[PDB]
Amino acid sequence: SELLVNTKSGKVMGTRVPVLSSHISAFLGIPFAEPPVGNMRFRRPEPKKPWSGVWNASTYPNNCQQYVDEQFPGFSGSEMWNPNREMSEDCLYLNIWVPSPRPKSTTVMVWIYGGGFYSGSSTLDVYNGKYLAYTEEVVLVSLSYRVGAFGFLALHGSQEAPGNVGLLDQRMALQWVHDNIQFFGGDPKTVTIFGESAGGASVGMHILSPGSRDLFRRAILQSGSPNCPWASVSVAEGRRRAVELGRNLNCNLNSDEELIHCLREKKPQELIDVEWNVLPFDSIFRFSFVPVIDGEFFPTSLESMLNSGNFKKTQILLGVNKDEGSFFLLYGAPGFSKDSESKISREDFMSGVKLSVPHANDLGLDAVTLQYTDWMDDNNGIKNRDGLDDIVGDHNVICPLMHFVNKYTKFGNGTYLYFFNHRASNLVWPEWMGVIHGYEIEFVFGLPLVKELNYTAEEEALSRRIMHYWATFAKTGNPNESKWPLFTTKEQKFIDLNTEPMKVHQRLRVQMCVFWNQFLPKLLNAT
Amino acid sequence: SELLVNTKSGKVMGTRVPVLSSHISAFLGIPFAEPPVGNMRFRRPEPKKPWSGVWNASTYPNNCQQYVDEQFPGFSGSEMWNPNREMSEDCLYLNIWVPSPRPKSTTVMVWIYGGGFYSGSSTLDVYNGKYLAYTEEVVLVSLSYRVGAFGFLALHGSQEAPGNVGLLDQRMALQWVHDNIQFFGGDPKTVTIFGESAGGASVGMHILSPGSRDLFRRAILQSGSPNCPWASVSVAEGRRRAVELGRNLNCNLNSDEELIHCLREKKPQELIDVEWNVLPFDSIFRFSFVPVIDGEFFPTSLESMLNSGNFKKTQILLGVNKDEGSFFLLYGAPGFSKDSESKISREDFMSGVKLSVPHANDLGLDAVTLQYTDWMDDNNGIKNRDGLDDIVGDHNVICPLMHFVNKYTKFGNGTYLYFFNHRASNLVWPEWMGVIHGYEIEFVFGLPLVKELNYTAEEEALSRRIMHYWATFAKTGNPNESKWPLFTTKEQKFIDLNTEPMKVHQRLRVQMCVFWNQFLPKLLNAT
Ligand SMILES: *C(=O)NCCCCCCCCN1C[C@@H](C)O[C@@H](C)C1
Ligand SMILES: *C(=O)NCCCCCCCCN1C[C@@H](C)O[C@@H](C)C1
């Protein structure tokens, strides 16, 4: 049976799914690790013991235990990212979409979802890539990991809760792919891992981490970097804010053992309830429990590794969205609302920049402002709003990416950089949000291909042409078969990704990023 | 006799001069102070004892003792500002151009030449305002003062050499005007003082200085401000760099008395020879001996006075030139030459900015650079050159003026601000220098009126219309009789001054000056 597959972990039964006038097979819910429940909570991932029967992979599995959004109940735009299956601590599983008839050795793609490391799901409608596997003819794999304290609590030193376990799940899922993806038709030596936000930062974290580079070939990073300010905390910070969690749930903090035990006694939702209370400051685009530069998963500091080319060298295709910051300002800054032009005032603006560069001192905040302010019309509300939408993206996404790009592209074997700036015609979010964080994925996963979803023809055509870029690159190591230029430390070329005739530019946000990537940091140290 | 005049200091014989197809009288060389020679050197100005005969004022007098330029021998563009009469320590005199027939009470104008306080002359061809008095029908007065150490050596405490004596000469010349300008037809209650560079900074220094505000009515400041970085030094700096002068001429520095005496023994040219050796750093647009915030001529710090409206409140008309910095870069920065496009390299540029903001630390120099650098084409030589021509002007002229403007225009009775940006058609300097420091004066003095000087008709028309602005303002307190808007702390309007139909703008170099006037200073203190 085309749906019956024999893995190194046991036989597994798949299911036939319809895909744009055709059909293919999907093996949903396959388990790659032991349930991270109970005493194992906070512990590193555990390999999944073999099953002596036939595992049923016809239905998506539970979503991990995570903070669910309720700022816009009903509203699809928000609920569209919320978990869509019974959340549970038993969540480490993976789904595989295999073409039909089943291949013998085709390009494999492994997807790592985002969520600020505090949220995420592999079972999201937008992540349903039966279209990618289908259209592009690849074997799409959707790994899943532990987000939240459940998978990032960093009580460094302790072995019961060392941190980064969530990245470890990611890794134990890439091994499984490396070990059995052949029995599914995939080619274990041509496996591309691609992700968004925290998933894009995880991708590159696997390029840096010595223990996982050998587990994949090339990578695609979307709106994320490992050297992103919110992508990691120190072992001290993780420690300090891990204790603050015990303190919040009234735990015993006499010693790690007591704490860890206590935290392991609290139900999941109790941890979730006081999760955000441990952050060091009032901030925008900052999350509680994220990877720690522990010295193991990460030999040394990220920068120093990017400086010594101490990272996996291969091909990488990456980029950013035109309007990243939007989502975090509407959700955190004062003066923003889902149902207005949210034109901001010098005040609200000045107050937002403090929420954006939280680690900045007053001289710093000054630099930022003077930098993103049209002093010829400093009262423009639409300007104050947009310039604020630029500080959130620039500082948290584009600039940290452009530094990892320039550093990688000096040891890597090839780099392709894009700037996606097309506003889905059916977006529901207020126009003032522009090309929003995470709204390229739908083009990447070919949702514009399914009619009922309301997309122009021009749009379905971008998805189709973007999907081939991703897929062609994943298989050949180059997006091309009209040409998307190679990014070089010399002519830093990149292109635009939208329904208009390909246009090639060069040096994505140089200026703003020279300030973020070079000036600000310096200043903030002198001062 | 229309040329025979009786002043409070004695009878004086003038001379008839031809002015554009007509004639008027000029009383040149009238003395307003006692020869500042010998033991009086460095001492404050001394009133000129009365003369028991008829003083001959038919010929320009000596130019003060000053550093003469020899970087472009022959070349008019440079020699045009050099002294044109036997330099001498006996130089405190004034020249008066009176219309003919002689008025009974007309608007008076007193001109204070520039020179970085180290140079200057009242007898310069460009300063020959027989055209202003003529055309505009005013009584033009050309005061003269002591420049150099000869008139600015600041051994504060000492009474033999207290400093600012040069400003004191300026003052003793304004008194004389206030006391006898009536006998020349002038109106002592409608006397405007106007100047360029150091002369524009002196103008406003007389607005701040309590002891001179009552000596004039309104003021015109051109390319200068009292709060200009090179316009003054502290009493410590003047002291320290005054001693360094003795040290340079091998004087005894056991005590003030010895030093002062010694300095008083050296011939003038010996002082001049080692003059520039006392500056604290390698710099551009910085001069040795300039006014000191001594606590007498200046009650307190300049800023604090501009903050407490502790200054003469009246009308003021002022402005800046499109390309100020030019002259100082060609004369001091590496990569510049009188006979080339002087396109600069990131290097030469980076090295020039250090010459421009000499008091800046490395974090500062960084801020400046990042601020005046197109990181999208950081190698543009024409850009590197111009952006460097902007840092010299911005930081040394426009910005310090725009801060004194905004501060004054909050206690003053009216403010008119211009931006002169027309390149004389007959300029000899390399085009890369644009609208150069001090090249508006010729329009202000109506040189475009004399044919033989080669000027378009469009040009003679600007001079004529600019002269009326100056004169009409000097008499009415308003430049107008098509309208030049009043500068207000609200809509900071100003206009352009060139042969094209008047255009009104608003907020001269806000952005760049928010950095110079606000950010940089802050940073440079935090750091
Ligand atoms: C990449 O991983 N980006 C993170 C994606 C998260 C979307 C923005 C929402 C984050 C802001 N939170 C703040 C907490 C306190 O409340 C929730 C509702 C929104
Ligand atoms: C307003 O007062 N501006 C000052 C006008 C001076 C013109 C620029 C020349 C100044 C630079 N100096 C430097 C010394 C060491 O040599 C002379 C030849 C030029």
Side-chain angles (χ1 to χ4, degrees):
Chain A
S1 189
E2 186 178 4
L3 301 194
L4 198 260
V5 186
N6 245 308
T7 68
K8 275 157 205 190
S9 282
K11 248 124 97 84
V12 346
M13 252 285 278
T15 187
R16 202 106 208 274
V17 301
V19 193
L20 308 173
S21 77
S22 206
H23 289 73
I24 64 168
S25 27
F27 301 80
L28 322 153
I30 308 165
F32 69 73
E34 277 291 293
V37 305
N39 226 128
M40 276 185 50
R41 186 208 263 147
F42 298 136
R43 256 165 172 214
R44 337 187 155 242
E46 175 110 319
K48 162 63 151 193
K49 267 322 128 228
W51 46 91
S52 330
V54 155
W55 187 286
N56 190 38
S58 57
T59 46
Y60 273 154
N62 307 317
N63 290 54
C64 280
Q65 204 67 109
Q66 73 202 254
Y67 172 97
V68 14
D69 158 298
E70 278 150 327
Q71 248 272 225
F72 295 107
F75 187 43
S76 82
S78 90
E79 321 284 89
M80 107 151 98
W81 308 99
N82 279 292
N84 63 352
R85 314 261 142 182
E86 242 171 44
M87 281 185 234
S88 166
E89 289 212 85
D90 174 333
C91 51
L92 304 189
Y93 301 94
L94 59 95
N95 332 265
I96 308 150
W97 283 276
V98 194
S100 171
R102 175 200 317 187
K104 306 291 177 211
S105 222
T106 38
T107 311
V108 273
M109 275 178 136
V110 175
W111 168 261
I112 325 196
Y113 64 62
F117 288 114
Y118 78 86
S119 71
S121 310
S122 62
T123 67
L124 294 200
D125 279 309
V126 244
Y127 301 156
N128 178 181
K130 83 229 210 126
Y131 313 105
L132 202 24
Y134 178 78
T135 303
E136 277 321 288
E137 216 107 56
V138 310
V139 176
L140 198 116
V141 183
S142 276
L143 70 89
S144 99
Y145 56 103
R146 291 180 280 164
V147 280
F150 301 101
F152 284 109
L153 186 71
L155 267 192
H156 196 57
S158 228
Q159 247 318 123
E160 287 319 290
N164 301 181
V165 302
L167 285 179
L168 279 195
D169 300 20
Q170 255 175 14
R171 201 194 256 158
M172 181 145 76
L174 286 186
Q175 250 291 171
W176 198 102
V177 167
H178 178 259
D179 299 5
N180 316 265
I181 216 60
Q182 71 230 42
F183 309 118
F184 285 87
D187 166 10
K189 236 38 109 242
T190 294
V191 31
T192 292
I193 77 179
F194 67 129
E196 213 270 344
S197 209
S202 303
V203 162
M205 268 167 172
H206 284 307
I207 281 171
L208 291 157
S209 209
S212 350
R213 0 230 248 236
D214 308 332
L215 251 28
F216 57 92
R217 193 127 179 207
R218 52 186 113 259
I220 285 146
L221 304 82
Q222 295 150 224
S223 303
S225 222
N227 71 305
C228 259
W230 49 266
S232 75
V233 323
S234 76
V235 264
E237 180 46 22
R239 192 154 249 299
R240 170 248 139 204
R241 66 165 78 166
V243 153
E244 189 71 39
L245 186 84
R247 219 181 277 209
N248 248 269
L249 275 154
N250 285 321
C251 279
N252 173 299
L253 322 171
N254 201 3
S255 40
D256 279 359
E257 305 73 62
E258 330 250 6
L259 193 29
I260 283 165
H261 170 231
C262 174
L263 262 3
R264 290 216 186 119
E265 260 209 321
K266 300 312 201 118
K267 223 56 102 58
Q269 182 61 57
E270 311 198 34
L271 262 60
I272 306 178
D273 271 349
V274 317
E275 201 212 273
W276 304 93
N277 308 352
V278 310
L279 275 156
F281 349 85
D282 205 359
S283 39
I284 278 324
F285 222 142
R286 243 50 149 197
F287 320 91
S288 250
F289 313 94
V290 290
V292 278
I293 300 314
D294 62 357
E296 317 183 358
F297 193 111
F298 293 103
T300 14
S301 75
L302 292 207
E303 186 61 351
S304 84
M305 292 185 73
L306 288 145
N307 265 339
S308 84
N310 178 9
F311 52 80
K312 164 172 198 83
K313 328 240 156 56
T314 170
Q315 303 73 37
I316 71 146
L317 185 167
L318 43 19
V320 318
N321 272 16
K322 188 234 209 300
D323 303 295
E324 302 272 12
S326 297
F327 223 93
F328 313 81
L329 287 149
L330 145 88
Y331 270 75
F336 291 106
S337 345
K338 200 257 259 158
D339 313 341
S340 40
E341 265 181 286
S342 303
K343 281 137 138 133
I344 272 68
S345 50
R346 230 308 137 320
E347 217 240 274
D348 262 344
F349 175 109
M350 244 154 49
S351 98
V353 18
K354 179 73 188 282
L355 247 29
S356 305
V357 191
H359 61 228
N361 65 9
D362 279 57
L363 204 236
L365 300 164
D366 283 332
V368 180
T369 309
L370 174 121
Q371 179 76 193
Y372 286 86
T373 295
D374 177 1
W375 290 118
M376 193 137 266
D377 169 60
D378 65 310
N379 266 313
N380 204 137
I382 274 164
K383 268 185 193 126
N384 288 354
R385 178 242 281 150
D386 291 345
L388 209 66
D389 176 57
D390 274 339
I391 276 132
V392 179
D394 276 335
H395 165 78
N396 285 287
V397 170
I398 286 117
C399 293
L401 179 149
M402 288 299 315
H403 164 84
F404 161 82
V405 171
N406 280 284
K407 241 84 181 39
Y408 190 82
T409 303
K410 184 104 227 169
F411 286 109
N413 194 229
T415 289
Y416 294 87
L417 182 78
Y418 77 72
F419 179 76
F420 174 83
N421 66 351
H422 171 83
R423 223 229 181 199
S425 81
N426 58 353
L427 250 183
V428 299
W429 296 98
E431 202 102 14
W432 76 261
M433 283 175 106
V435 188
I436 319 142
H437 194 62
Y439 279 75
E440 91 267 359
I441 308 160
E442 49 189 66
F443 282 80
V444 163
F445 274 91
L447 277 271
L449 288 217
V450 17
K451 304 292 109 227
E452 315 66 31
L453 306 188
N454 299 132
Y455 280 93
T456 70
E458 295 70 57
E459 242 140 51
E460 121 146 55
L462 199 67
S463 177
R464 277 196 175 296
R465 112 131 162 287
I466 275 213
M467 268 183 306
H468 197 58
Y469 277 166
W470 268 226
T472 292
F473 164 79
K475 118 199 137 216
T476 79
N478 181 326
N480 307 274
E481 258 159 321
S482 226
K483 279 272 183 222
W484 179 341
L486 230 182
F487 177 92
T488 77
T489 2
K490 260 146 94 58
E491 331 261 79
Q492 354 226 337
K493 307 195 182 193
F494 76 80
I495 81 187
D496 267 352
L497 239 36
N498 53 34
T499 75
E500 308 149 15
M502 192 197 268
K503 182 95 128 171
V504 169
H505 315 279
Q506 170 209 343
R507 267 165 194 258
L508 200 46
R509 349 247 5 229
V510 213
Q511 226 82 35
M512 283 320 103
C513 295
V514 191
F515 157 84
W516 289 110
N517 288 330
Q518 315 175 220
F519 183 62
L520 188 57
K522 236 202 131 145
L523 160 163
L524 248 165
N525 250 345
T527 64
Chain B
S1 189
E2 186 178 4
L3 301 194
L4 198 260
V5 186
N6 245 308
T7 68
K8 275 157 205 190
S9 282
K11 248 124 97 84
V12 346
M13 252 285 278
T15 187
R16 202 106 208 274
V17 301
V19 193
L20 308 173
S21 77
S22 206
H23 289 73
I24 64 168
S25 27
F27 301 80
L28 322 153
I30 308 165
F32 69 73
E34 277 291 293
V37 305
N39 226 128
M40 276 185 50
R41 186 208 263 147
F42 298 136
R43 256 165 172 214
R44 337 187 155 242
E46 175 110 319
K48 162 63 151 193
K49 267 322 128 228
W51 46 91
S52 330
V54 155
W55 187 286
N56 190 38
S58 57
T59 46
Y60 273 154
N62 307 317
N63 290 54
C64 280
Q65 204 67 109
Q66 73 202 254
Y67 172 97
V68 14
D69 158 298
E70 278 150 327
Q71 248 272 225
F72 295 107
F75 187 43
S76 82
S78 90
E79 321 284 89
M80 107 151 98
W81 308 99
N82 279 292
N84 63 352
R85 314 261 142 182
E86 242 171 44
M87 281 185 234
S88 166
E89 289 212 85
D90 174 333
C91 51
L92 304 189
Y93 301 94
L94 59 95
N95 332 265
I96 308 150
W97 283 276
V98 194
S100 171
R102 175 200 317 187
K104 306 291 177 211
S105 222
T106 38
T107 311
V108 273
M109 275 178 136
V110 175
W111 168 261
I112 325 196
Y113 64 62
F117 288 114
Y118 78 86
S119 71
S121 310
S122 62
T123 67
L124 294 200
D125 279 309
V126 244
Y127 301 156
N128 178 181
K130 83 229 210 126
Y131 313 105
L132 202 24
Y134 178 78
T135 303
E136 277 321 288
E137 216 107 56
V138 310
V139 176
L140 198 116
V141 183
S142 276
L143 70 89
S144 99
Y145 56 103
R146 291 180 280 164
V147 280
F150 300 101
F152 284 109
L153 186 71
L155 267 192
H156 196 57
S158 228
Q159 247 318 123
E160 287 319 290
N164 301 181
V165 302
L167 285 179
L168 279 195
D169 300 20
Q170 255 175 14
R171 201 194 256 158
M172 181 145 76
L174 286 186
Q175 250 291 171
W176 198 102
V177 167
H178 178 259
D179 299 5
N180 316 265
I181 216 60
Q182 71 230 42
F183 309 118
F184 285 87
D187 166 10
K189 236 38 109 242
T190 294
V191 31
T192 292
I193 77 179
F194 67 129
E196 213 270 344
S197 209
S202 303
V203 162
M205 268 167 172
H206 284 307
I207 281 171
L208 291 157
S209 209
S212 350
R213 0 230 248 236
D214 308 332
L215 251 28
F216 57 92
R217 193 127 179 207
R218 52 186 113 259
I220 285 146
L221 304 82
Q222 295 150 224
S223 303
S225 222
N227 71 305
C228 259
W230 49 266
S232 75
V233 323
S234 76
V235 264
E237 180 46 22
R239 192 154 249 299
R240 170 248 139 204
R241 66 165 78 166
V243 153
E244 189 71 39
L245 186 84
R247 219 181 277 209
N248 248 269
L249 275 154
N250 285 321
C251 279
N252 173 299
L253 322 171
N254 201 3
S255 40
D256 279 359
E257 305 73 62
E258 330 250 6
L259 193 29
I260 283 165
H261 170 231
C262 174
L263 262 3
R264 290 216 186 119
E265 260 209 321
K266 300 312 201 118
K267 223 56 102 58
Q269 182 61 57
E270 311 198 34
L271 262 60
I272 306 178
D273 271 349
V274 317
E275 201 212 273
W276 304 93
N277 308 352
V278 310
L279 275 156
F281 349 85
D282 205 359
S283 39
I284 278 324
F285 222 142
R286 243 50 149 197
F287 320 91
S288 250
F289 313 94
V290 290
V292 278
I293 300 314
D294 62 357
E296 317 183 358
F297 193 111
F298 293 103
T300 14
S301 75
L302 292 207
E303 186 61 351
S304 84
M305 292 185 73
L306 288 145
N307 265 339
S308 84
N310 178 9
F311 52 80
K312 164 172 198 83
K313 328 240 156 56
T314 170
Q315 303 73 37
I316 71 146
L317 185 167
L318 43 19
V320 318
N321 272 16
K322 188 234 209 300
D323 303 295
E324 302 272 12
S326 297
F327 223 93
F328 313 81
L329 287 149
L330 145 88
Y331 270 75
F336 291 106
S337 345
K338 200 257 259 158
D339 313 341
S340 40
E341 265 181 286
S342 303
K343 281 137 138 133
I344 272 68
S345 50
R346 230 308 137 320
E347 217 240 274
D348 262 344
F349 175 109
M350 244 154 49
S351 98
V353 18
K354 179 73 188 282
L355 247 29
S356 305
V357 191
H359 61 228
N361 65 9
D362 279 57
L363 204 236
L365 300 164
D366 283 332
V368 180
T369 309
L370 174 121
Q371 179 76 193
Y372 286 86
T373 295
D374 177 1
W375 290 118
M376 193 137 266
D377 169 60
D378 65 310
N379 266 313
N380 204 137
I382 274 164
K383 268 185 193 126
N384 288 354
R385 178 242 281 150
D386 291 345
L388 209 66
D389 176 57
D390 274 339
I391 276 132
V392 179
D394 276 335
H395 165 78
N396 285 287
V397 170
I398 286 117
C399 293
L401 179 150
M402 288 299 315
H403 164 84
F404 161 82
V405 171
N406 280 284
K407 241 84 181 39
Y408 190 82
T409 303
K410 184 104 227 169
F411 286 109
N413 194 229
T415 289
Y416 294 87
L417 182 78
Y418 77 72
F419 179 76
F420 174 83
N421 66 351
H422 171 82
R423 223 229 181 199
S425 81
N426 58 353
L427 250 183
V428 299
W429 296 98
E431 202 102 14
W432 76 261
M433 283 175 106
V435 188
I436 319 142
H437 194 62
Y439 279 75
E440 91 267 359
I441 308 160
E442 49 189 66
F443 282 80
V444 163
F445 274 91
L447 277 271
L449 288 217
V450 17
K451 304 292 109 227
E452 315 66 31
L453 306 188
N454 299 132
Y455 280 93
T456 70
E458 295 70 57
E459 242 140 51
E460 121 146 55
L462 199 67
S463 177
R464 277 196 175 296
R465 112 131 162 287
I466 275 213
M467 268 183 306
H468 197 58
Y469 277 166
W470 268 226
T472 292
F473 164 79
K475 118 199 137 216
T476 79
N478 181 326
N480 307 274
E481 258 159 321
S482 226
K483 279 272 183 222
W484 179 341
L486 230 182
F487 177 92
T488 77
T489 2
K490 260 146 94 58
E491 331 261 79
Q492 354 226 337
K493 307 195 182 193
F494 76 80
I495 81 187
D496 267 352
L497 239 36
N498 53 34
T499 75
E500 308 149 15
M502 192 197 268
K503 182 95 128 171
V504 169
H505 315 279
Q506 170 209 343
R507 267 165 194 258
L508 200 46
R509 349 247 5 229
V510 213
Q511 226 82 35
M512 283 320 103
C513 295
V514 191
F515 157 84
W516 289 110
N517 288 330
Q518 315 175 220
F519 183 62
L520 188 57
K522 236 202 131 145
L523 160 163
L524 248 165
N525 250 345
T527 64

